[PDB]
Design a protein around this motif. Structure first.
Motif, short mmCIF file in Angstrom:
data_model
loop_
_atom_site.label_atom_id
_atom_site.label_comp_id
_atom_site.label_asym_id
_atom_site.label_seq_id
_atom_site.Cartn_x
_atom_site.Cartn_y
_atom_site.Cartn_z
N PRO A 81 -12.47 8.36 -36.46
CA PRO A 81 -12.45 6.90 -36.60
C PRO A 81 -13.65 6.41 -37.40
O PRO A 81 -14.77 6.90 -37.23
CB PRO A 81 -12.49 6.41 -35.15
N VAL A 82 -13.40 5.43 -38.27
CA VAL A 82 -14.40 4.95 -39.22
C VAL A 82 -14.68 3.47 -39.03
O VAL A 82 -15.84 3.04 -38.97
CB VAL A 82 -13.95 5.23 -40.68
N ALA A 83 -13.64 2.64 -38.95
CA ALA A 83 -13.83 1.20 -38.90
C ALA A 83 -12.66 0.55 -38.18
O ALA A 83 -11.58 1.13 -38.05
CB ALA A 83 -13.99 0.62 -40.31
N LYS A 110 -19.64 1.36 -30.20
CA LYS A 110 -20.71 2.33 -30.02
C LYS A 110 -20.16 3.67 -29.55
O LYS A 110 -20.47 4.72 -30.13
CB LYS A 110 -21.74 1.79 -29.04
N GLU A 111 -19.35 3.65 -28.49
CA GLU A 111 -18.78 4.89 -27.97
C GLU A 111 -17.84 5.54 -28.97
O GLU A 111 -17.80 6.77 -29.09
CB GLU A 111 -18.04 4.60 -26.66
N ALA A 112 -17.08 4.73 -29.71
CA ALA A 112 -16.16 5.25 -30.71
C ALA A 112 -16.86 5.63 -32.01
O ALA A 112 -16.25 6.32 -32.84
CB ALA A 112 -15.06 4.23 -31.00
N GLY A 113 -18.10 5.21 -32.20
CA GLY A 113 -18.83 5.54 -33.42
C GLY A 113 -18.29 4.86 -34.65
O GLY A 113 -18.28 5.47 -35.73
N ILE A 114 -17.83 3.62 -34.53
CA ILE A 114 -17.19 2.91 -35.62
C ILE A 114 -17.95 1.62 -35.89
O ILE A 114 -18.69 1.11 -35.05
CB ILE A 114 -15.71 2.60 -35.33
N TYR A 204 -12.15 8.46 -26.03
CA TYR A 204 -12.25 9.91 -26.07
C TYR A 204 -12.74 10.43 -27.42
O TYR A 204 -12.65 11.64 -27.67
CB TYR A 204 -10.90 10.54 -25.74
N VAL A 205 -13.27 9.56 -28.28
CA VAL A 205 -13.62 9.96 -29.64
C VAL A 205 -14.65 11.08 -29.63
O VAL A 205 -14.44 12.15 -30.22
CB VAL A 205 -14.12 8.75 -30.45
N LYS A 206 -15.77 10.86 -28.95
CA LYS A 206 -16.87 11.83 -29.01
C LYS A 206 -16.49 13.22 -28.52
O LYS A 206 -16.74 14.19 -29.25
CB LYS A 206 -18.09 11.28 -28.25
N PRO A 207 -15.89 13.40 -27.34
CA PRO A 207 -15.54 14.78 -26.93
C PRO A 207 -14.48 15.43 -27.80
O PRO A 207 -14.56 16.64 -28.06
CB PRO A 207 -15.06 14.60 -25.48
N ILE A 208 -13.50 14.66 -28.27
CA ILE A 208 -12.41 15.25 -29.05
C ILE A 208 -12.91 15.68 -30.43
O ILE A 208 -12.53 16.74 -30.93
CB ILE A 208 -11.23 14.27 -29.15
N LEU A 209 -13.77 14.87 -31.05
CA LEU A 209 -14.35 15.27 -32.33
C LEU A 209 -15.18 16.54 -32.19
O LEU A 209 -15.10 17.44 -33.03
CB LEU A 209 -15.20 14.14 -32.92
N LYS A 210 -15.99 16.62 -31.14
CA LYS A 210 -16.78 17.83 -30.90
C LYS A 210 -15.88 19.03 -30.63
O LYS A 210 -16.19 20.15 -31.06
CB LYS A 210 -17.74 17.60 -29.73
N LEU A 211 -14.78 18.82 -29.91
CA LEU A 211 -13.84 19.90 -29.65
C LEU A 211 -13.23 20.43 -30.95
O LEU A 211 -13.17 21.65 -31.17
CB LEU A 211 -12.73 19.43 -28.71
N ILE A 212 -12.77 19.52 -31.82
CA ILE A 212 -12.13 19.93 -33.06
C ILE A 212 -13.08 20.75 -33.92
O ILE A 212 -12.69 21.75 -34.53
CB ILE A 212 -11.60 18.70 -33.81
N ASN A 213 -14.36 20.36 -33.95
CA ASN A 213 -15.33 21.04 -34.79
C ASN A 213 -15.73 22.41 -34.24
O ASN A 213 -16.20 23.26 -35.00
CB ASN A 213 -16.57 20.17 -34.96
#
Ligand SMILES: Nc1ncnc2c1ncn2[C@@H]1O[C@H](COP(=O)(O)O)[C@@H](O)[C@H]1O
Ligand SMILES: Nc1ncnc2c1ncn2[C@@H]1O[C@H](COP(=O)(O)O)[C@@H](O)[C@H]1O
Ligand SMILES: [Cl-]
Ligand SMILES: [Cl-]
Ligand SMILES: [Cl-]
Ligand SMILES: [Cl-]
Ligand SMILES: [Zn+2]
Ligand SMILES: [Zn+2]
Ligand SMILES: [Zn+2]
Ligand SMILES: [Zn+2]
Ligand SMILES: [Zn+2]
Ligand SMILES: [Zn+2]
Ligand SMILES: [Zn+2]
Ligand SMILES: [Zn+2]
Ligand SMILES: [Zn+2]
Ligand SMILES: [Zn+2]
Ligand SMILES: [Zn+2]
Ligand SMILES: [Zn+2]
Ligand SMILES: [Zn+2]
Ligand SMILES: [Zn+2]
Ligand SMILES: [Zn+2]
Ligand SMILES: [Zn+2]
Ligand SMILES: [Zn+2]
Ligand SMILES: [Zn+2]
Ligand SMILES: [Zn+2]
Ligand SMILES: [Zn+2]
Lengths: 317, 317
Positions: A81-83, A110-114, A204-213
Motif C-alpha cells: 500500500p502506497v496512498a 501510520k500502521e498501514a505505512g501510507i 495487517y500491512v506490516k506483518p504480511i509485507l514482512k512475510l512476503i519478503n
C-alpha cells in the motif's frame, strides 16, 4: 441489490477496451498494467459501523476501519500500500467530529505505512442524514510477484491471524439482531455492546509485507465480508480447517439464532487474515507473524476440491 | 465548513512522512513519485446536482459529471487519465436508476478514454436519503512533462474552451436562488430550469491531450469551483482577459442579484477550461482545439502580478 448493481458492473467491464494496448490497462483489487509494475487499486466504505459511532459520539477509530478495509485488500495480491484518498459526506461540518475522524485517519495511515494524499468533503444536509466515510487506496506490486492463488497446491498449510473488530456486512446483521433486544449499553463479557460493534478492524500491512519478503507465500486472504468464502476464491482445491473456538460477540450472535453455517459465511469468527505457505515454511511463517499479532495454524489445502471442511465444527461450505 | 475540514487536511499532511524515501511518495491533483513517472490521483463528487436528477428521474448524465470533475483535474497537470473507481451510496437499490447511472458512466469513460475498474456500492437507507455518487481517478505523466505553471511568463496567451453545464459549487447557489422563485419547470431561453441545472459538464481529455502532444503548453486550468480563481493559482503574474458575454443560465442568475464580481468567482461564465501557450502558438493551438469544442482567445499574461483584469467587464479579482 444484486440485480441493480449488475448494471453498474456490466457497464464498467465494457469500458476495459478503452485502455487496450494502452498504459494502465486493467488485468480483492484491480491490477493496472504500468509495464514496470502493477498498480493495485481498491475502494471500500465503513458502512453502518458509523451509525454506532454517531450514537456514542466516538469517531476516533472509524478512520482505522476505512483504511483497514482498503489496505487489507491491497496486500492480498502482494501489493505494498502506497496512498489513500477518502470521501467524506456529512450532514453538518461538526468541528469536534472531524477532529475525531482525523485522529483515526492518522493512526490508520501510520500502521498501514501510507500517505493520505487527498480526498473530497461534501456537506450535503439534504443528501446525508449523518456521516459517510469511504476511501480508495493504491498499491504497487512487481509483475512476477503477484499473489494470485495459482501456486496453491494440496498439502499447503493455512495460517490464521487473529482478528479485532467486525466488518460492515456482518455488523448490519449484528445491529438488527442485538440492539433492539439488548441495547447499546448492554455489558457482555466485560465490554458493552456498542464497544463490540464499534471496535476497529485490524490492519495487517506490516506483518504480511514482512512475510512476503522473508517467506514463500502461495495465497493471501482478507477475511472480510463473506467469511471463509474469501478462502474458496483463492484456489480450486479444498480446505481442511480447524477454526478457533467461538468467542466474544460472535458467541452472543450465535446464541441468538444465527446458524453456524451462516456464521462462517458472514463473520470472521476470530481470524481476520489468512495466509497459505508451503508445508515446510510453517514455523518460519508463524515466527514472523507472531512478532505482530497472534498467528496460528488453521489447516491445509486438500485434493478434494472447492469444499472447506471445518473439522471441529462439522461444517462444509 | 472550512474550520472543521482543516482537521482532516492537517492530519493527512502529517502522513506524508510515511512514504519518505519510499515508492509512491507524494510531491488539482496529488502527484505520487513512481520513479519512472508521476501517478496523478484526484477525487470528486457530483454534489447537489444529483438532487435535480432525482426530481425529474433523469440519471443518465450524472455519471458524466462525476467522471468529468475527476478527469478534467487530472489533465491539468498534463496527466493522461487511465482509470476511475466510483463510490455509490444509495437509500434503496432502484434497478432503473442504477441502469440510468450506468449509461452516463459508460459514455463518460468513453469520452475520457478511461476504464472504470472498480468501486463500492453502499445500500444504507438509514444513512442516505437519496443517491450519492463520487469517484477517484488516476492518471500518468512523465516527470519532465508535468504542467505546473512555472513556465507561464508575461505575453503568454490565454485560450478558453467553451463550457457545457454547471459545477456543484455554483449549482448550490443556483438552486436556492432560482428554484423557489421560478420552479424546476420554468422555461428560460428554450430550456427548462432543471435542464439548465442538470446539463452535464464537459470532458476535455481528448482535445487537451492532443494539444499537449502537438503544441508547447505552459499552463492548464480547469474552470470548476472558484471560476477565474482557478487561473490565479497557476502563476504569480497577472492576467488581462476579455471574457465571453454573459449568456444562458448565468444571465438569469446575474439578473437575480448576484454581482458580476462573485459571478466570476463561482461560475465558469462560459469557459470550462483554459490553456496558456506562447504567443506564437495561438493559431496552432486554436486550430487543434476547435476540432473538438469551440475555442477562442481570451487574453494574455501580464507583468502586473496576481490580479486578473476582465477588460470588457471592468472586474478585478
Ligand atoms: N476529506 C478530505 N480528505 C483529505 N483531503 C481533502 C478532503 N477534502 C478536501 N481535501 C483536499 O483539499 C484541497 C482542496 O479542497 P476542495 O477543492 O475544497 O475539495 C485538495 O488538496 C483536496 O485533496
Ligand atoms: N459501484 C460500483 N462500481 C463498479 N464496481 C463495483 C461497484 N460496487 C462493487 N463493484 C465491484 O464488485 C466487485 C465486488 O463487489 P463488492 O465486494 O460487493 O463491493 C468488485 O469487483 C468491485 O469492484
Ligand atoms: Cl478491514
Ligand atoms: Cl466480521
Ligand atoms: Cl467537470
Ligand atoms: Cl459552473
Ligand atoms: Zn489488453
Ligand atoms: Zn464495503
Ligand atoms: Zn474490502
Ligand atoms: Zn470551534
Ligand atoms: Zn523480478
Ligand atoms: Zn512457492
Ligand atoms: Zn478486515
Ligand atoms: Zn524443502
Ligand atoms: Zn523452508
Ligand atoms: Zn524451531
Ligand atoms: Zn521525500
Ligand atoms: Zn467537489
Ligand atoms: Zn475537481
Ligand atoms: Zn426488475
Ligand atoms: Zn523524457
Ligand atoms: Zn515552453
Ligand atoms: Zn468542469
Ligand atoms: Zn519563434
Ligand atoms: Zn510556433
Ligand atoms: Zn494560418
Amino acid at each position: 441489490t444484486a440485480k441493480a448493481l449488475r448494471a453498474i458492473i456490466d457497464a464498467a467491464r465494457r469500458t476495459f477496451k478503452f485502455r487496450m494496448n494502452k498504459i494502465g490497462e486493467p488485468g480483492y483489487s484491480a491490477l493496472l498494467d504500468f509495464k514496470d509494475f502493477y498498480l493495485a487499486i481498491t475502494t471500500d466504505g465503513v458502512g453502518t459501523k458509523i451509525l454506532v459511532a454517531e450514537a456514542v459520539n466516538k469517531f476516533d477509530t472509524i478512520g482505522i476501519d476505512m483504511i483497514a478495509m482498503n489496505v487489507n485488500d491491497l496486500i492480498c495480491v502482494g501489493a505494498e500500500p502506497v496512498a489513500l484518498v477518502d470521501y467524506l459526506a456529512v450532514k453538518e461540518p461538526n468541528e469536534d467530529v472531524f477532529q475525531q475522524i482525523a485522529k483515526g485517519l492518522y493512526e490508520g495511515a501510520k500502521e498501514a505505512g501510507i500517505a493520505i494524499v487527498g480526498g473530497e468533503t461534501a456537506v450535503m444536509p439534504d443528501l446525508i442524514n449523518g456521516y459517510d466515510l469511504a476511501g480508495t487506496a493504491v498499491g504497487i506490486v512487481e509483475k512476477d510477484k503477484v499473489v494470485t492463488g495459482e501456486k496453491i497446491k494440496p498439502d499447503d498449510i493455512v495460517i490464521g491471524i487473529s482478528s479485532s473488530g467486525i466488518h460492515s456486512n456482518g455488523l448490519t446483521l449484528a445491529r438488527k439482531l442485538l440492539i433492539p433486544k439488548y441495547g447499546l449499553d448492554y455489558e457482555y463479557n466485560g465490554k458493552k455492546l456498542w464497544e463490540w460493534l464499534l471496535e476497529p478492524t485490524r490492519i495487517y500491512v506490516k506483518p504480511i509485507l514482512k512475510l512476503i519478503n522473508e517467506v514463500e507465500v502461495h495465497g493471501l486472504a482478507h477475511i472480510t465480508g463473506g467469511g471463509l468464502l474469501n478462502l474458496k476464491r483463492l484456489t480450486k482445491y479444498g480446505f481442511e480447517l480447524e477454526m478457533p473456538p467461538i468467542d466474544g460477540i460472535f458467541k452472543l450472535i450465535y446464541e441468538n439464532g444465527v446458524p453456524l453455517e451462516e456464521m462462517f459465511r458472514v463473520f470472521n469468527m476470530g481470524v481476520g487474515f489468512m495466509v497459505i505457505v508451503p508445508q515446510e515454511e510453517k514455523e518460519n511463517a508463524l515466527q514472523i507473524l507472531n512478532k505482530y499479532y497472534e498467528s496460528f495454524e488453521l489447516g491445509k489445502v486438500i485434493k478434494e476440491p472447492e469444499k472447506i471442511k471445518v473439522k471441529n465444527y462439522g461444517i462444509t461450505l
